[PDB]
Design a protein around this ligand. Structure first.
Ligand SMILES: [K+]
Ligand SMILES: [K+]
Ligand SMILES: [K+]
Ligand SMILES: [K+]
Ligand SMILES: [K+]
Ligand SMILES: [K+]
Ligand SMILES: [Mg+2]
Ligand SMILES: [Mg+2]
Ligand SMILES: [Mg+2]
Ligand SMILES: [Mg+2]
Ligand SMILES: [Mg+2]
Ligand SMILES: [Mg+2]
Ligand SMILES: [Zn+2]
Ligand SMILES: [Zn+2]
Ligand SMILES: [Zn+2]
Ligand SMILES: [Zn+2]
Ligand SMILES: [Zn+2]
Ligand SMILES: [Zn+2]
Lengths: 321, 321, 321, 321, 321, 321
């Protein structure tokens, strides 16, 4: 309000650590972190991912072991991403709802072993189709909206039955949130949260995910911002408990507008390519390790309530010290 | 959007600790706490304050002893309140700017031993006038505005000279922020912060401070909210680095409006009477100790960047667990 | 608008009582007060509450006597809180809807004796369950949402049948307002108001209520503010005539945001622990009695239309003089 | 939110007096009333005003008699309007600043007898010029702006010297607020309030004031609303402590906009013609007496902090019941 | 934007008629006027109304004659108010929907004679009940909401059948707009407009209407402003084509807020008592005739699209000249 | 609110002329029109402008003849554009401030014959420089800002001296409004209005003006909208009484934003090319004459207070019917 130099010098609050601490507008805590993890079939399996240095795909027995540390660090939740054996992929994506699928078995195992740990399952067909699209194809190769929802609903129900506290539809079909919510309510899964991937973009930043585990007709055009508000509005009306933006850093303006417009629990995914970029630069000595906390603090400043990040264990370790 | 039961059940996020953690909107940290402390003239002395159970007036040697632990707990700053010997009070309030006054001695001692600890001095005449009004009286007993500013300016300079990083005018004279800022700038105290008590009310909640250590013509009417915004706007234009509301909990609506309107560093004082009423109830077994963190979290939720609170040590200890 | 010292001196309107009166932004009146009262079974019963000095639990005959003064003072309404005999508590909470329960008998007695006095009954199961939770438990000890609503509906209907003009659901089940409204409308209770406890927090300030008469899965996290707006929006859509924030003082920022966002009749509960805090401090001589009116004026300034307060009789007496 | 019949029936809160009381948004109190009064030159004289039934011009002795009752009723302030003897009018308006003029004598007399009663003097030349324009005329009959300010400044100082707490420039010269403020500050009248007639319209509702006691080049076009906001902004920047709209009821939309835009102390004048049309209709039996309180409540609802009204005594009497 | 004297002198645009005309923000035209008219049974009947000087009650033959002038003046619409013979009043208000009632006969006669003239009929039971309440009473003397709607629906249909282009429900029952709209749509009266009396206050300004032709449980409390927005929102959702505030001048702040919030066609009624007030003062010589156009211009400035005014013929005459 | 078909049918208000009239949001009146006119040096001369069919350059005697009818039609003001004889142009533009230049002679002649008619002179050098740029060129052919202001100031004073009520700087030099205002104030031309061409674009729509009578370094880029708000803010702060956008129809969005942002008197120029394209199409039989009123109504709807238009006579004639 009519602030002018030299009466106002914004450097004064910057002069000392104590005053920078008092005026600091945002903080990252371990309550903000969600750890995504790639889950293998089998026993005693651990696979390094070349394009995501430091991240490993884990069979369920190994996941249970590593989760001991994650829980001890106070990380609130995991987001599970199964790595489907290629032979179990099909046109109808039926493995998506197999009670003995990787995601379902992993969920039951973690829910028994660590009852307070949040498990967020991935509701999508892309790791179950032979073609790798997020839904079922018609005879022109188009991803059918409503037919795909029918399969996503079965999948979500199977995750709820396995004990997941949160299902996270990452498919970008229109209307899927309401369809899934209706099915959960009808089946008695009253308190299963739905974390909608509301504004999920058709992005180049997904590169490394493929190595861990057309799209422009469902995923959003990177150019568009207003459209993300309409996407989130629909998902909230349809019953989502949380809404998500993906990717993350390249979309912090979207996080900001979404938080400002709806004042709802807003989440963001720091995707594989964001992780890879940062880690490559750190390893090369081009960026200091402090960039990890800075990247995560950005999400908080931009309005996120929680962050899906492959840095979650390291960040949690740094935060505790 | 159009969120409606049962598609929207706001209890889902409440169902488990992990989700409550993920969606929690505010957190209290040690970086938010400012510890006020009453300082005595002598050596190896403490006094218990009857109307503030658990709070002690401390001689400077005892202040340095207790500050070692405050610093270890990570408390960023102290607010010093001298307890002036009655023999040093006067109509002209000259003790306010004595280079060997309690505040100035305490400041030099703390700046030397704990160089990173913030020291916020109190710029006001009420502890230095025989009558205890915050400024100089005319012959009808009205508190003169501009004559009082002249004394306040000298006092503020004396604090800067003693090494205080922040001076906090608590007097509610009109225009004093700008006068003090000009004086600091002209004397080369470029980086001395001014924490304005901007919206300071004429309140019954100050009961116990008089024990620890006319008003309606300068302090604000408890009925008034819009007026607080005009007070803060003036102080920001006059060069304040931070602005404060006092009292605190009884005025959380004012905190909220002030933060929302100006988005400037906004502080709040949980005053003596607020401390006493909480502590009295805790000691009677009427409220759990958890009320302390609840009361301080309220300030964060209401938009405060920092909190002057007699519970700062107790809070810092609890937060360290 | 470009107001600057010394052209603008905000002390001028403060200089005299007459001008402070002319610019005073808010006023407390007896039209703003609701008196909560604890009601005992039996005849000629009066019980002091150690943790709420000055408040008595009253059998219905004694309540009728005391209500003579309350009505003569112009207090518009009472909020009734029965003290259920321990032997009448059960798993199914059936006493909640007993036409011969304390609340129902008290309502009929007051409606006959004082036809213009508002009676606000408490719709909740916590004073009727053996376990003291606000709803019915499942086999995991979780408070079931929709099953509890069924009982709350019967309770609300029983209160309407007893002649209550207002029912006030304090249970924090999702969707209960709409369920209760639907039931009242279907039964012909067209003009029975519903005063929703919309943003009711899981708070330490409830201590003394227990002596007068888990929760984090239904009552709100003190940290959360945006969430309160979503709570109130739902209750207004579901048909509430009034909406309430509880507790009070520690949540004045919430009152302010709720009034600003919805422009609906907004109420606030100055809870047992707030009363106890203030009264303890007054009795100890730490705060002047004037703090009572200041506390209540705060609620008006923050945007409340009415206040549930155990100070209502004393405040009404002070206001009349 | 999405409030819809029959879930929402806005008549429920209307059903009973107690609920209408609880939700009532505004109230009129005595603290809102300013009583205008026409003051004569002589001794033991009153005159009935034909076009304002029930209002009397009062000599100063009679003014002191009536003020005893105004003070007893708790009316905070009077607005004095002298009735200048024709022989004292002139082209230079010099009687405006005569230390023994009616206004100045009346002010001294009231300040001495009733020290707590606010006195608001009228700063304008229209009762002092032979032609009755509010400023000094040039040779073409245009009302000169800055030449008129010089006289207005002298008049305002004379009022301050006589002890008025508030001076109220009613002239609608550009820039006069700042000129008067500067003069007051430079003369040491630090605390004299300036109540600007900010949005004063060229209105037919002034009919009866001329009986009681060119204009379109200074007073505002009744058609214009946005222009009123610019007028008020200038007066606030120039140092006004209060701002006023005149006339009143015919301009309630302007009151509302002005309060909403500036959130400053906002006053309204229910002018002679508004009084006369109400009083005439009441006397003819065409409107009930209750219309008086209704008209004044309108001002409060529209956002006025205070009301200059010829009904102030009658209102205060009714409010005291 | 930083406008300051003397760079900005707001008197410059006021200096000459031409510039005042160029900047004039609002204009009144005959397209804004609706003429209310009281209609008698019988032939060759004309009755002066003592409390509304210049207004006559007219039998239908006389109405047709006078309407010649009104149409020639360009007045767009009449609002018809029948004066029901006392013997035709009843408990069931059945005369309200008599195809041979005054309003119905008058409507058919005017629709035939002047096909382009708008006819707005009055949907309410108060001129048809023996008791004069706007709806049907229950055995406690309360105006039943939904039972009254059933009769209002029959009335509205009868007006549509008679050829009215607009029906204007003035009853203040909850939900009546949607009920009437549903009935009109079901019956094929697709283009019959509904002009809701949305915010109709329980006012003293209605005095003279009674002579031309309890309420607090349906009509609004004069104190309330926010409530008017909720009233209008419901009426727009329920299908109103126009919304109305009544009374007029004493509620211009309400007109302003309603226009600003909803941007819908907004109408205002300058009621009998407003007409009487002004006319009495004009006749007495207390106000100039120019007050008529000023009063009407106020409504435009406040945001009204049209005005129901007993001044419509005189205003139209003045506008044309 | 939630307006939905078929409860809401927006065609109902469209059904009849009377209702379209009642809800019509904007109207054009004669008071909105400013007539631009090209003025020749000689006597008893007119010239037809090839690129503006129907518009004539007029010698001053012929201007006085045509103005009699313009005044009779009620047109409030003319904007004069001299057509400078080539022999009077120069690098220093000195003819701009000649007391016997065309503009000055025309102004004196019109002020004398038609004292109530507004005269708006054109403050710019483009009709006075040999090269036709709006300011003075440096040796590289850049239009110098502040050197050009000095000439513009002299020109503006010459217009004031000739009696113009309004001067309208059309030059788009930075800072010229304030410079001209200061000069007018210092010379005693207190009431001379300054109509700033604030947002004047570098447009192809000026084609025909050059026939009638580099630019991208001063006139605005057609692509830019936010920049127009900054231009207007500066001009208002510098003391403009009115602000203008030019061209007009191609910039109606700018009109709307400017009115909405500043709520100041906002004017628009329908330039030569807009006139020519409309008139050409009307003459070819491609558009009806009704397009003229439609184009001018657009300006009103977009928020203009007044319109400079070559159709002003034709419009005024049509509006008089
Ligand atoms: K902090
Ligand atoms: K979190
Ligand atoms: K007041
Ligand atoms: K109230
Ligand atoms: K105009
Ligand atoms: K109209
Ligand atoms: Mg979507
Ligand atoms: Mg201040
Ligand atoms: Mg709820
Ligand atoms: Mg002004
Ligand atoms: Mg309604
Ligand atoms: Mg410019
Ligand atoms: Zn997918
Ligand atoms: Zn002090
Ligand atoms: Zn409960
Ligand atoms: Zn005057
Ligand atoms: Zn009626
Ligand atoms: Zn030019």
């Amino acid at each position: 309000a009519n602030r002018a130099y030299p009466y106002t010098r914004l450097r004064r609050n910057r002069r000392d650590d104590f005053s920078r601490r008092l005026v600091r507008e945002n903080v990252l805590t371990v309550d903000d972190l969600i750890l995504p993890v790639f889950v293998l079939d089998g026993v005693n399996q651990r696979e390094s991912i070349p394009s995501m240095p430091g991240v490993e795909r884990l069979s369920i027995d190994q996941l249970l072991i590593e989760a001991e540390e994650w829980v001890a660090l106070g990380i609130p939740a995991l987001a599970l991403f199964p790595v489907t054996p290629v032979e179990k992929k099909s046109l109808d994506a039926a493995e998506a709802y197999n009670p003995e699928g990787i995601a379902q078995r992993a969920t039951r195992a973690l829910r028994e072993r660590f009852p307070e740990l949040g498990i967020i399952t991935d509701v999508c067909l892309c790791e179950f189709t032979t073609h790798g699209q997020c839904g079922i194809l018609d005879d022109d190769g188009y991803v059918l909206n409503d037919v795909s929802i029918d399969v996503l609903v079965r999948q979500a129900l199977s995750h709820a039955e396995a004990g997941a506290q949160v299902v996270a539809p990452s498919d970008m079909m229109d209307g899927r949130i309401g369809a899934i919510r209706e099915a959960l309510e009808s089946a008695g899964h009253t308190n299963v949260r739905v974390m909608a991937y509301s504004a999920k973009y058709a992005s180049a930043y997904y590169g490394p995910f493929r190595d861990a585990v057309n799209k422009a007709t469902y995923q959003m055009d990177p150019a568009n911002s207003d459209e993300a508000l309409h996407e989130v509005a629909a998902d909230l009306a349809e019953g989502a408990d949380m809404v998500m933006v993906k990717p993350g850093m390249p979309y912090l303006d979207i996080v900001r507008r979404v938080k400002d417009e709806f004042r709802a629990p807003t989440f963001v995914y720091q995707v594989s390519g964001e992780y890879a970029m940062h880690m490559g630069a750190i390893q090369n000595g081009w960026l200091a390790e402090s960039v990890i906390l800075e990247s995560l603090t950005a999400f908080k400043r931009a309005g996120a309530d929680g962050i899906l990040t492959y840095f979650a264990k390291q960040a949690a370790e740094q935060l505790r010290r």
